[PDB]
């Protein structure tokens, strides 16, 4: 129902979470994440509904994100990337790469 | 580059690799993978350039795949889904979910 070309339009990278705070103003329970995506992209912020994880579980965790969306305002915060996770019977479960560095690209 | 809708159009699921064999006719080194995506989608086949993994590393592994591409013929084989992995300095590294069941959808 899409093309292989449609998927190539999406820029999906490995990132590493470096800071986590509560997103107090958000409707949904959420964290503000500051994520490093390597020497060229640098740091981007994200809103993520992943409060099933404790903050200490996310520090230095390698995650996967869409990095070429338009910035999304949510209250007074700008979410710059979308962190990918599966919607499961036990909440959102992050996607992780088996290995890789921040800024590595999904094929 | 895109909008959120460009991403939402892509159907990305958790699947589990059930069978792995060598894709002997492919010019790139690749495995043929039979992957279970839950009781609605069922089984799908994929060609994956992940021969840096041993076959016994992949059996029972939860992976992430795009499930709504058109089928892609590669030699005499039809690859039905795209298994997602990061392109790293040490080869392709599969994406895995932290948890989830086959057919669970990426948000």
TrEMBL record, chains A, B:
Does the record bear tRNA-binding in its keywords?
Answer: yes
**Positions of the TRNA-binding domain:** 6-107
- Xref: InterPro entries: CsaA (IPR008231), NA-bd_OB-fold (IPR012340), tRNA-bd_dom (IPR002547), Tyrosine-tRNA_ligase_regulator (IPR051270)
Sorted alphabetically, the keyword list is: RNA-binding, tRNA-binding
A molecular function (GO) held by this record is: tRNA binding
Q: What is this protein called?
A: Protein secretion chaperonin CsaA
Q: From what organism does this protein derive?
A: Picrophilus torridus (strain ATCC 700027 / DSM 9790 / JCM 10055 / NBRC 100828 / KAW 2/3)
């Amino acid at each position: 129902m899409i093309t292989y070309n449609d998927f190539s339009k999406i820029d999906i990278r490995v990132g590493i979470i470096k800071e986590v705070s509560d997103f107090k103003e958000a409707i949904k329970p959420a964290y503000k994440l500051k994520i490093y995506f390597g020497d060229i992209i640098g740091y981007k912020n994200s809103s993520a509904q992943i409060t099933n994880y404790k903050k200490d579980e996310l520090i230095n965790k390698k995650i996967i994100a869409v990095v070429n969306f338009p910035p999304k305002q949510i209250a007074n915060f700008i979410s710059e990337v979308l962190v990918l996770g599966a919607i499961t019977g036990d909440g959102v479960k992050l996607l992780t790469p088996d290995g890789g560095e921040p800024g590595d690209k999904i094929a």
